[PDB]
């Protein structure tokens, strides 16, 4: 889950 949630927000840093 944790890596997937991080990935959802990947394009916004």
């Amino acid at each position, epitope marked *: *889950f944790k890596e997937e*949630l991080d990935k*959802y927000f990947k394009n916004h840093t």
Partner: antibody
Amino acid sequence: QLQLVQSGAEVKKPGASVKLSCKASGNTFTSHYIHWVRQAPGQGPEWMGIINPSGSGTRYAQKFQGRVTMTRDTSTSTVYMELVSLRFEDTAVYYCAGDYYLDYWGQGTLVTVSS
Amino acid sequence: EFVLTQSPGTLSLSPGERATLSCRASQSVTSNYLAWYQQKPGQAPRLLIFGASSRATGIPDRFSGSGSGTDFTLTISRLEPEDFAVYYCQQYGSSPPMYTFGPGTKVEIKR
């Protein structure tokens, strides 16, 4: 030592807006995901949305899309939630919670919407 | 928002007895992303279980979770006085982020 301290109770007229705050205390050395969850009288909790540790990204529950805004101030370890166009049904206790699984919780802020 | 049911609505049991709480999703729970929370009056919810079966840090061993597909269970092996409370399951997901609390089961003291 992950703890959250929320702002005090609010009373608002219908149609107004409210801005709640949630400040981390104790171990404030890293940044975490923060969620907002509300609970109307006699009801179960309802998830409103999430802001990522940097504050660069948010995602709101569809029921609140267009009505809620979350922001955070890394300098003060504070997260904000603003809810606009308040309705009678928005009377509830509003919680913030931290980490991936809402692992720790603030104490709640009562918001009453009434004339 | 996911669609969840919890049975029974109220569970009436005595201290020391085993409690079995059920949560059912309308469709198969993707990746077993199912959590359980405890809530007492005047307090915030408290995380018990995440990922269907992982116990959160500091939660007693008497709390355990199991399940897959549409059917998930929270078992309290022996009820202690502090365990009588409302219990919510919750389905969560990553794309898009979504957390949906179930309707809740109240565990009350039978007398």
